[PDB]
Amino acid sequence: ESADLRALAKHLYDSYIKSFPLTKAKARAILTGKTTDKSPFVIYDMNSLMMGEDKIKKEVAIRIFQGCQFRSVEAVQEITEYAKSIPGFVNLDLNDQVTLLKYGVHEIIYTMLASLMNKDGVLISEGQGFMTREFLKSLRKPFGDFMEPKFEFAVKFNALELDDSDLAIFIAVIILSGDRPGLLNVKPIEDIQDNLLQALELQLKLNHPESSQLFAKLLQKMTDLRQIVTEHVQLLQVIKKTETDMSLHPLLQEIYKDLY
Amino acid sequence: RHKILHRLLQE
């Protein structure tokens, strides 16, 4: 009933808060100025990047890309701990848990990256940097084209005005996708997803009662996400080939090989 | 295969 679905929403929200250092709430406070914290160091060019080494952790495009690579691995780790909190996930066949993460994590990375983004740029290093969109486009190819589709997506997605409590359920729904290639036992995955989808719908009616068919708009975006992921795998396929002075992190190698 | 993913899950 309604009560059970509310309890699921809250269990997931609490779990989201623990798993993810920088929430959409903190990120929006930073981006609009309303936090009382020191504003993020702005990285709008080659020099500002250089001066900003002190606030974050061979050639420039490549160094940015390898920074993006470090953060992804951490995201994958955070998303993995979050999954394990989704009721019934750890009782699935372990090979299915792996498959779900393999195909889901980048979809959640782009969903959650939108929390950190406006039309002008993206917070980095847990809100203490802000790397402009023009700077990321200005990078020499193929690195110029890497982040721009994530900005395009974020701009539309941010218009739905979801908060953390909505996003916690949406992300869980994405992870429990019964149509991922190679799943061994779909039915228990779908049973959990059906339950999350009802929890998401109730949440969207309660938390945005003036927004009608937010639930439906939000499901349509789950398909947009698969595109950006496929588009992204192919640019990475290109980068793997056309560049040599850079190795992909082993965890990201696991995820991307034999993927879409 | 997926040794790290396995490790992160079994943790």
Author numbering:
A (entry chain A): 207 to 263, 275 to 477
B (entry chain B): 686 to 696
Can you quote the paper on this entry?
PPARs form heterodimers with retinoid X receptors (RXRs), recruit coactivators, and subsequently bind to specific sequences on target genes, termed peroxisome proliferator response elements, thereby regulating transcription. The ligand-binding pocket (LBP) of PPARγ is a Y-shaped pocket with a volume of 1300–1440 Å3, which is much larger than those of other nuclear receptors.
We tried to determine the SB1495-bound and SB1494-bound structures by a soaking method from the same crystallization condition to exclude any possibility that crystal packing affects structural changes. Unfortunately, we could not observe reasonable electron densities of ligands from the soaking method. Alternatively, we determined the structure of ligand-free PPARγ LBD from the same crystallization condition for the structure of SB1495-bound PPARγ LBD by co-crystallization with the coactivator SRC-1 peptide (60% v/v Tacsimate, pH 7.0). However, the crystals of ligand-free PPARγ LBD belonged to the space group P21212 with the unit cell parameters nearly identical to the crystals of SB1494-bound PPARγ LBD. Since the crystals of ligand-free, SB1494-bound, and R35-bound PPARγ LBD belonged to the same space group with similar unit cell parameters, the SB1495 binding to PPARγ LBD would induce the structural changes in helix H2′ and the Ω loop, resulting in a different crystal packing.
